[PDB]
């Protein structure tokens, strides 16, 4: 009868994928805007 | 003189001057001021605990032997001895440090009897708390805290039908009839014993290893799982310097340690004794015919058969870090020997978050804390595989892995918000900082590891291939499901570093 706790159990047993991923990219060898 | 230690004649057999012996007293006094010597009451407790675990092993083998229908005489003389290794048997260990134990039983006590019979013997024993006997996923290991003393017990099965109460694992013949998994286990205590016997003065070796191990920990070059040498590796490195200076004190060893090792012409390996061949026909580390052992950057070969390279995980980046940290420590070691610097100046903390311009943020997220610990351990284990793939680009000239990881707990509100936290997007969300499991059996628990980058150097850099391989390499784990766990990698500049990586008072890089 505890609706918040039932939503937690539905969150634990959830079969949906957890997050996703993306490719990374670093910009510039830093000749401009140096430290 | 009349003594020849190591595989080469020493550098100098000269005694310790009054200044060297006085600096040695200052070195030991500094090590004591850091609480690196535990206490006399706690070491006496570890002895009573080990003798208590030895009485259980006899009770353990005797019960399993009677179940195999052994006679009253054979089951009594079956025995079963427990050994120790690692930081404890070397005598170099601080307070709260765990005792790397090892149980030796005859072959009629299988690994199945190790988890089925010994685990209940420990819980019913009124002095064992927090027993986490994990069924073998890597090596038969059991962790608990007998009387508060943390123990890591490793199983080892010998083919000899009886194990006496006074057995020594020095004879190479005992390795026969033993599975390869249980051979590498015994190799842990065989090498720990061989180290303590190949050094001239044992007391000088222990004080020197205390300062070198401490210095390595204070500069994050001690973790083996990321490519830096381990405790046994550092022990063999200070053991080699003790051989070259037989009658020197610990302060002399530490001061000469950094100079000799960073000017050592690698990959000439370090050997505490001539490599001995044995009965079993297995690889014994020959870089002239094995190409795998040839590629070892800084080989440190264990003296016990079979001789293996303990520092095989070292990559190009870790090697450069070790050499550069040895150069800085050497210059400090030279100025403390002239009383121009205190001994405490050598144990300064690292400066990882101020050395590189770009840091590779690697986090591992999970829904529960039990799954988080299992998931955070695997992602860190596959970290050395990422730096090896990052070295192949060589737009990156250096990929420096970091020692530990930062655990933060997010308290998400909606189910759609937790999916963002589980990904690279991090909005203004509450993140509590924790250390380990909670509750004692929508929150998203994370564990972040970093990798420093020094760029070779046009307009942009794409590391999409190593990051994608790292994703599949972590998700290939058999104990994984994308419904609970995930892992992603992000970029971070000097100015973009979080506030957690800086202790109060530090100056963030402003560029």
Residue numbers in the entry:
A (entry chain C): 288 to 322
B (entry chain A): 11 to 451, 477 to 492, 498 to 551
Give excerpts from the publication.
The S. pombe orthologue of the human PAXT connection, Mtl1-Red1 Core (MTREC), is an eleven-subunit complex that targets cryptic unstable transcripts (CUTs) to the nuclear RNA exosome for degradation. It encompasses the canonical poly(A) polymerase Pla1, responsible for polyadenylation of nascent RNA transcripts as part of the cleavage and polyadenylation factor (CPF/CPSF). We report crystal structures of Pla1 in its apo form and in complex with Red1. Taken together, our data reveal the molecular details of recruitment of Pla1 by Red1 which leads to hyperadenylation of CUTs, serving as a signal for exosome-mediated target degradation.
To understand the molecular details of the Red1-Pla1 interaction, we determined the crystal structure of the complex. Co-crystals of the complex appeared within three weeks and diffracted to 2.81 Å resolution. Our crystal structure of the Pla1-Red1 complex shows that Red1 contacts the C-terminal RRM domain of Pla1. The interaction interface of Red1 can be largely divided into two regions. The first half comprises a short α-helix at the N-terminus (α0) that helps orient Red1 onto Pla1. The second half of Red1 is largely involved in mainchain-sidechain interactions between Red1 residues Gly306, Ser308, Asn311 and Val312 that pack against Pla1 residues Gln420, Val518, Ile520 and Asn522. In addition to these, the Red1 C-terminus, spanning residues 323–345, is flexible and therefore not observed in the crystal structure of the complex.
